[PDB]
Amino acid sequence: MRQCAIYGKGGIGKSTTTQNLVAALAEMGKKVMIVGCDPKADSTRLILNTIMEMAAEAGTVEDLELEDVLKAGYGGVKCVESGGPEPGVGCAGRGVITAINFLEEEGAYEDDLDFVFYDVGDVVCGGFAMPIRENKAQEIYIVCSGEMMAMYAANNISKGIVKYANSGSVRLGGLICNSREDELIIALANKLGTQMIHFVPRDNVVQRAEIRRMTVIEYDPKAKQADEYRALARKVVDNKLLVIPNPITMDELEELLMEF
Amino acid sequence: SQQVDKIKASYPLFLDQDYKDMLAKKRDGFEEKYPQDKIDEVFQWTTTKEYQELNFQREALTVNPAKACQPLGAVLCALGFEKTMPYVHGSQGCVAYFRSYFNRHFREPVSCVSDSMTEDAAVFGGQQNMKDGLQNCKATYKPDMIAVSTTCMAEVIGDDLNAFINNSKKEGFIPDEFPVPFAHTPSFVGSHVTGWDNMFEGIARYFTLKSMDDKVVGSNKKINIVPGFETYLGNFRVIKRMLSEMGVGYSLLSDPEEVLDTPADGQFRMYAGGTTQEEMKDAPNALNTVLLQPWHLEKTKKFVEGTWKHEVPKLNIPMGLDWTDEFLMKVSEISGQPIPASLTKERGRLVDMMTDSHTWLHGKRFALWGDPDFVMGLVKFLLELGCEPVHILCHNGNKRWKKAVDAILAASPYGKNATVYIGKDLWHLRSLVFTDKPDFMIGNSYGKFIQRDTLHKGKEFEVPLIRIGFPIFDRHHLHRSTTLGYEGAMQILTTLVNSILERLDEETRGMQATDYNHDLVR
Amino acid sequence: SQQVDKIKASYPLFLDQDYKDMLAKKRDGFEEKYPQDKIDEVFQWTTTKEYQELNFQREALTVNPAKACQPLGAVLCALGFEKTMPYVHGSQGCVAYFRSYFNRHFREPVSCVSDSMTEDAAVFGGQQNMKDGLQNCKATYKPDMIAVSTTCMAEVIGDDLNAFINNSKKEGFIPDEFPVPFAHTPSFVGSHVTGWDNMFEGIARYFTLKSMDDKVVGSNKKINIVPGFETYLGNFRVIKRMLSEMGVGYSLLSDPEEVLDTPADGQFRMYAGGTTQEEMKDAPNALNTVLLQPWHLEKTKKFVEGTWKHEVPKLNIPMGLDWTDEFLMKVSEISGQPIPASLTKERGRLVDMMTDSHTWLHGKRFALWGDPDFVMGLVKFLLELGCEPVHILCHNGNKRWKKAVDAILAASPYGKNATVYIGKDLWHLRSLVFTDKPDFMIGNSYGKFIQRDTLHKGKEFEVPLIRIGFPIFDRHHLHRSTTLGYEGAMQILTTLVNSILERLDEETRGMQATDYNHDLVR
Amino acid sequence: SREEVESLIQEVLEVYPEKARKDRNKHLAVNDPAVTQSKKCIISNKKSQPGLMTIRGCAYAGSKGVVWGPIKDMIHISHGPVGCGQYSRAGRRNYYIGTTGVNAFVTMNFTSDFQEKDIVFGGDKKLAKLIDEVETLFPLNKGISVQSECPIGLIGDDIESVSKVKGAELSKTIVPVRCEGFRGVSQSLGHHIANDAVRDWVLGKRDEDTTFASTPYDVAIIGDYNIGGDAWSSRILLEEMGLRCVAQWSGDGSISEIELTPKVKLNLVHCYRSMNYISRHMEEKYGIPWMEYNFFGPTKTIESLRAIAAKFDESIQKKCEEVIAKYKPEWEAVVAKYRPRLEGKRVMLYIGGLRPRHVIGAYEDLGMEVVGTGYEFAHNDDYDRTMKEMGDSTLLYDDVTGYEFEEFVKRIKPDLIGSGIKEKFIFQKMGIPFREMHSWDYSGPYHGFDGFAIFARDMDMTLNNPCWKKLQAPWE
Ligand code: CFM
Numbered sequence A: 001m002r003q004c005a006i007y008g009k010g011g012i013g014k015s016t017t018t019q020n021l022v023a024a025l026a027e028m029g030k031k032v033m034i035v036g037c038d039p040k041a042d043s044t045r046l047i048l049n050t051i052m053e054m055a056a057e058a059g060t061v062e063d064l065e066l067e068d069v070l071k072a073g074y075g076g077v078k079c080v081e082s083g084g085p086e087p088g089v090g091c092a093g094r095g096v097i098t099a100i101n102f103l104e105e106e107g108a109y110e111d112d113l114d115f116v117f118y119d120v121g122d123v124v125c126g127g128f129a130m131p132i133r134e135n136k137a138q139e140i141y142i143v144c145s146g147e148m149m150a151m152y153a154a155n156n157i158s159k160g161i162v163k164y165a166n167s168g169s170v171r172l173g174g175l176i177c178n179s180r181e182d183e184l185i186i187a188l189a190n191k192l193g194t195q196m197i198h199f200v201p202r203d204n205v206v207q208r209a210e211i212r213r214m215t216v217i218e219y220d221p222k223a224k225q226a227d228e229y230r231a232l233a234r235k236v237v238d239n240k241l242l243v244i245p246n247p248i249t250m251d252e253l254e255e256l257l258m259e260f
Numbered sequence B, C: 001s002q003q004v005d006k007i008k009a010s011y012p013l014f015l016d017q018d019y020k021d022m023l024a025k026k027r028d029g030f031e032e033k034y035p036q037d038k039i040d041e042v043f044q045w046t047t048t049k050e051y052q053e054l055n056f057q058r059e060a061l062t063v064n065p066a067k068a069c070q071p072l073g074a075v076l077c078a079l080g081f082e083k084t085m086p087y088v089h090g091s092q093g094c095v096a097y098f099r100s101y102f103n104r105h106f107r108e109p110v111s112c113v114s115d116s117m118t119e120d121a122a123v124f125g126g127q128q129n130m131k132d133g134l135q136n137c138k139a140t141y142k143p144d145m146i147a148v149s150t151t152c153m154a155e156v157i158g159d160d161l162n163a164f165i166n167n168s169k170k171e172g173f174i175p176d177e178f179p180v181p182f183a184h185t186p187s188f189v190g191s192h193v194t195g196w197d198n199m200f201e202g203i204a205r206y207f208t209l210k211s212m213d214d215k216v217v218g219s220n221k222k223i224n225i226v227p228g229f230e231t232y233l234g235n236f237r238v239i240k241r242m243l244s245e246m247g248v249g250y251s252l253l254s255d256p257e258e259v260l261d262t263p264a265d266g267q268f269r270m271y272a273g274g275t276t277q278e279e280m281k282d283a284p285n286a287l288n289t290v291l292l293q294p295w296h297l298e299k300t301k302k303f304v305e306g307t308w309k310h311e312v313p314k315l316n317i318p319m320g321l322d323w324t325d326e327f328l329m330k331v332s333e334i335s336g337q338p339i340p341a342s343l344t345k346e347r348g349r350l351v352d353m354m355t356d357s358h359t360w361l362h363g364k365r366f367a368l369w370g371d372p373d374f375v376m377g378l379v380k381f382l383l384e385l386g387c388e389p390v391h392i393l394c395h396n397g398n399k400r401w402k403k404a405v406d407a408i409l410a411a412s413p414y415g416k417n418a419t420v421y422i423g424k425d426l427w428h429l430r431s432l433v434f435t436d437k438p439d440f441m442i443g444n445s446y447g448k449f450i451q452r453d454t455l456h457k458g459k460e461f462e463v464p465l466i467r468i469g470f471p472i473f474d475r476h477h478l479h480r481s482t483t484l485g486y487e488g489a490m491q492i493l494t495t496l497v498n499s500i501l502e503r504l505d506e507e508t509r510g511m512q513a514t515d516y517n518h519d520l521v522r
Numbered sequence D: 001s002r003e004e005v006e007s008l009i010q011e012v013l014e015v016y017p018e019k020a021r022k023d024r025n026k027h028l029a030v031n032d033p034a035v036t037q038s039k040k041c042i043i044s045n046k047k048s049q050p051g052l053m054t055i056r057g058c059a060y061a062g063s064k065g066v067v068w069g070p071i072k073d074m075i076h077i078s079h080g081p082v083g084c085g086q087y088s089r090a091g092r093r094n095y096y097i098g099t100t101g102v103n104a105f106v107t108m109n110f111t112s113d114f115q116e117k118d119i120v121f122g123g124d125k126k127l128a129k130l131i132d133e134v135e136t137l138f139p140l141n142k143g144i145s146v147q148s149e150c151p152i153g154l155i156g157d158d159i160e161s162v163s164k165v166k167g168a169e170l171s172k173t174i175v176p177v178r179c180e181g182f183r184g185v186s187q188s189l190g191h192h193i194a195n196d197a198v199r200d201w202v203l204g205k206r207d208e209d210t211t212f213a214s215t216p217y218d219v220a221i222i223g224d225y226n227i228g229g230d231a232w233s234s235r236i237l238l239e240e241m242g243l244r245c246v247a248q249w250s251g252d253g254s255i256s257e258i259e260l261t262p263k264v265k266l267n268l269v270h271c272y273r274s275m276n277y278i279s280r281h282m283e284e285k286y287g288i289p290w291m292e293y294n295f296f297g298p299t300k301t302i303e304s305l306r307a308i309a310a311k312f313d314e315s316i317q318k319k320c321e322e323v324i325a326k327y328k329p330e331w332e333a334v335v336a337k338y339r340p341r342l343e344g345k346r347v348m349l350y351i352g353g354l355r356p357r358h359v360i361g362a363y364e365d366l367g368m369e370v371v372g373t374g375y376e377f378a379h380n381d382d383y384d385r386t387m388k389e390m391g392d393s394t395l396l397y398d399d400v401t402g403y404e405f406e407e408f409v410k411r412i413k414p415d416l417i418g419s420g421i422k423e424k425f426i427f428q429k430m431g432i433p434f435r436e437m438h439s440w441d442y443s444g445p446y447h448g449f450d451g452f453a454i455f456a457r458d459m460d461m462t463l464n465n466p467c468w469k470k471l472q473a474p475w476e
């Protein structure tokens, strides 16, 4: 029963890759659960009532039934969305804390799953780090690009890992690159002391499926990009490299970029 | 003016003519006060059934609450452990208030620290505060254990208590083996009782979760007793007494009876007595575990049944005759010890008292409030006495609780004019005692204001307060009473008949008017 | 008229207009009642210092006494022994009254018989009544001992109790070996307390006087404890508790705790517990003997010192802080048992309560009454609390007692406005609280009438009654209280401050008038 | 005692870890009355060291608890979870005359009692709804204040917009106070935020307004919270002196009094710490001068009356001498009775931001000397004023920890201590007479001449009480 957290810059295709990956995973016969914890995106729209909205409606979290929140989708993937305020108000961070707590307390993780995937938003506070506390996610994968602000984000996340790593059992499982950019991200990983678990090529089919509310695996199982996600899935299922990252300086970053 | 040998304090000083006149000039001259006729009109309206519909239609406003926040219960739970300092992670205002609140009720010192999180710690996280705070508290106040709870500010920003404490140990601020159990206690969830449950479970976890492999159920031959949020010292005492009387080996988990009652002998003792660390470590070896206040010990029950593998008995709070009988017989069953002649006789003496006083208690109507277990045991007792608990309010109660208490009310003819209100406050109840007037209210000190309001409407409409619950700030040493067991039931019964008789003597004290019924014997 | 679902008792039925106009027609029509203005004029007068002088100049009339007659104490004394039937030689009216008086105070059955002496027995002596009665009582009620006291009718005619019982045994009415102790208890000598002293000495004599030669002082290694006329069940209980706690071997001579507090379990127990015949017979073998109420245990002391050769300690009643300390150190001295940590901590907790509450107790003035030992110890505790016992009244007190109490008051600044009145009654005291108004009265149920008089004068003149003493007929289960030891001291203190605070809350409950000082925390 | 207090300080500090050791060192000192500048002797108003059992409160306690809360005809809303509101409900004895629940609301607790969903979704819509509910249920209120608790400040709840829209709509003055508990380091910043909220939303309401009939003798009591009736016992003197007291700041204060305050001739400031901000503001905007006064004890009351009357004409000055003479027999009676009972007794004090220096003269009128004094949250300007009022080699302590205070008391051994409820039962246990100098131990007044009588009565009943002679068991 492996719990994994997925962080990365959203303007890339963080949510889309997470879902295509989980779809490939479910396709291999793996029982997966996706937990949406990203206010800046829709984490289950491709696989398919949030915990927070359902709670308010029923009064409180204590009045919530797991069946009201968990819904099965493609490949039998179980989906749960934390929920959160509308834009510019409230506190989405606490919404994540509450949702995860509810899932813990309502025995959602003890059903016999193979994987749990947290699709997390930018760690701007403790609440969005809820997924990487003890007894939660042990494996962290960051989706990145050759863009600067995209690699810098990869580092900030690593610094956040380091912090919770010295305190418990949580490691960086590697980098996933959404399309010499191929080489750049590889060096970024070597610097971090981890790896680039997979280079997801650019392919219009992903958008085609995405705009039609599907992952490539469901949209077109025979597509070449479909096999790319199946390749990522296998590399994740067999991955054994979990590490505590060695963040770099923005200077060291401008050096790496300037070398390409 | 003041005469040196008959000095007046605020009452009756301000009732003197020069002050009364000055106050009148302040009002007419600068206060722009609404005319008394308008003040009188609005008051009468706040008394009507029309105002009551409006009052009960509130969905955003809360006026005069009958509950407090989680951390307060957390501090009390932690005080029940040997040489432990309750530590609240977050801002300090909370702690000053927690301490003050308990000082005023117990009339004793209450020790608790904060790590004083300020505006920059709200923005950066309270990790540094936790490192230095744990180090300073251990070095200065020297406890054997520090029990960490939280204030809302630290809960909003998601300060990971577990990581923060582990990093504190890792960096050398406190020893790796120094006990530091923790519990996230959000103000905005539940109430003070939930804080107790979270903290107790957090300590239970700390001392037993890892060590479960060498534990055998029933091997130490004791029964664990988990008290819950308890502010009556006599309740810790009566349970310990009844079990020792039976020869029942027990372990009371969270016992603040000694710290909250040290002697004024010349020295201040910050710590006194309490459940030892070893009693908590050895707890899974017990025959079973009895939770005295089950309706707010739900997370604890789940850890005890889940991890300790104990079959916690479905037992209600031991208040009143039936539930005390049930408690003793269950304790008898589990331990193998028979209920002794002493307790049997004590039971008959409470029944004796009931047969002596039933005449005055019959059909007496009561408005009452408090925490869910207390208020439920009280309803049951009142019902055994032939009394009608007309208005039952539990601000912090939930839907299942209301069902349970409605079931109890359904089982007796005395609970037929009774309604249970959850999530309602004392301003809601203020209305209830105005529109459907009972004979007395049984609640805490905040109900003295409801009595004041009912008396302003008139002497006939006045509903007297019988001070039972928490907090009692306006009377002294009531925190020494007993509410639990037959002992507690006898105390409660005496207070109720004598409040009834006190009130009757008051209404019959009029010379040649009502004193024809001012009887010597009652 | 009566509404079936809101039935009114005497109060408030007679306040209805049809009864109020009916009552007015009875008064104006056939009562020839003095005009209200003359009734109010004389009331006002009975309030003045002028009326007080006349009142205190009385030498023949006694109005509203604060004492009862000898046999009552004799009946209570006898009830303190195992399976003994109190027997009062004389007129039966006495017994009916003794029983009713004690039933109303303890709310229990009190067993006692008379040999019902009629007019002819008044003329021929009660010798036949003694013969029949001892035979009838022993066979019907089956006691193991019959303790004989007397009514005034039998005392005036000089019925020799000793001869009559000896002739009863000789004629085969009761066996020769059947225990029948006696005591001449004249109603026109002293009071109920003297009757207890007399009855106790009679029982001590019966069992020990002939047996003295084989007795050795201190050989059974116990301390006998003689309680005296005691009507608070918590007092027998606290003394037995503190001695057992110290590990002191003792024997309580006259112990009615069990008969006066039987359980309502399904059966009626006429007898229960008590001091055994053997404890009485073995009594001279004790290390010493401690009299808890020395001022009414003088004859007993003379028999114990003269007869048993015991060196009775010069000890005051153990009420208050100092006299409990003294009692404990004396019992420690005699027994050789150290005063344990539990009692040391209990003393510190009473002192703690005193420091917590001194602010409200200070300078508070009290009028009080009761039996000599009780009122003496009440005065000392009030003094230790910073209060002023302004009017101390003891109807049944003597000159030497007034001396001792004056010595107590002269040793403290709080007794500088105090006066002691012996041989005076409650009509005398009624005047003292009118002319030199104190804050409260501490007395029995008879003071409820003084409270109604002061209130009639007006609210600012009202002196509230705090019910401590005997008899308490208008409240329930107060007979279960404790007046002795630190425990009793804690109960009295709580009752005093809370009475002060209840009264202050009433005075400041006036909306917009006096409620500026109606504080939540006190 | 000159170097015995410095070695004491060092000995006490020995128990702290190094970081806390160096910070507390500069917060403790020995007085030298020649030090007009306290910053080379003691620093203050810095944050509390974590885990050392400080006695301090928060910004909410300063705003809601002390400044806004006393204002009787407004409804003050503790915005956030149920806690703050409950603990501070009627804990401070800020007296008032009014019919509670109808036209006065001081002892009541109005809260938004935040639940998880109000934290996550935000509570501005809930606030708006709550305001409509206090309007139908408490129609006679003359304004509303919104007192922020910690969560409101993190979550970014735009409460001033809610206050603006609801206030304009209902034609009500609704004041938003950003007094969330984590701001600042104590109650002190809460005073400041509250003073600013008063000027920005209430004070200038009657600015272009000339309806009020002014008099050359108009004054305002600023910073007297009427604890036990302290302000009423102060204005009786001021008004007998011929002055007209148009306003009382917060103690029994009304909103109209506050609005009418810019119309006066002089601001008489009692509590310098909590309201010097609004006074200074009234000087630069309305031109109203302000001066500090002390009504604790006869020597100070007399001095104060004379200084205050000297700002006016000869008729007020003449009435000033009339009042001093009127009460002279009375306070001399109190001194004659209680001073012999109290002379030479030593007192250690530790209160808020004004009493630790303000009650000194009153204690000295009874022959008692203050051997130690300190503040929870004062700034250096309060300590500047403290040097003249204290004796020479005395102890001074800012934001004293539970440990420090206990040990200082163990060395010094004062006959009486004056502090709050959180330390009361600690020292009674230790056998030392204690008087609450925040709540007056439910007595009061202590201000003015009639208040002095009660002060002396109280110090005497506690210090010379018979219980203190019985702490030790005769058998040990
Ligand atoms: S602890 Fe006053 S600066 Fe402030 S509530 Fe008490 S020493 Fe305050 S005088 Fe005052 S009425 Fe006060 S006593 Fe200034 S208002 S934050 Mo706690």
Ligand code: CLF
Binding pocket: B069, B070, B071, B091, B092, B093, B094, B095, B097, B150, B151, B152, B153, B187, B188, D058, D059, D060, D061, D080, D081, D082, D083, D084, D085, D148, D149, D150, D179, D180, D181, D182
């Ligand atoms: S500094 Fe949240 S509910 Fe109110 S007591 Fe707190 S845990 Fe409880 Fe000051 S603003 Fe309030 S008392 Fe901020 S939270 Fe403490």
Ligand code: SF4
Binding pocket: A090, A091, A092, A093, A094, A124, A125, A126, A127, B156, B157, B158, D154, D155, D156
């Ligand atoms: S940064 Fe995080 S903890 Fe702070 S208000 Fe926003 S979502 Fe909540």
Ligand SMILES: [Ca+2]
Binding pocket: B106, B107, B108, C352, C353, C356, D425
């Ligand atoms: Ca105490």
Ligand SMILES: [Ca+2]
Binding pocket: B352, B353, B356, C106, C107, C108
């Ligand atoms: Ca009975």
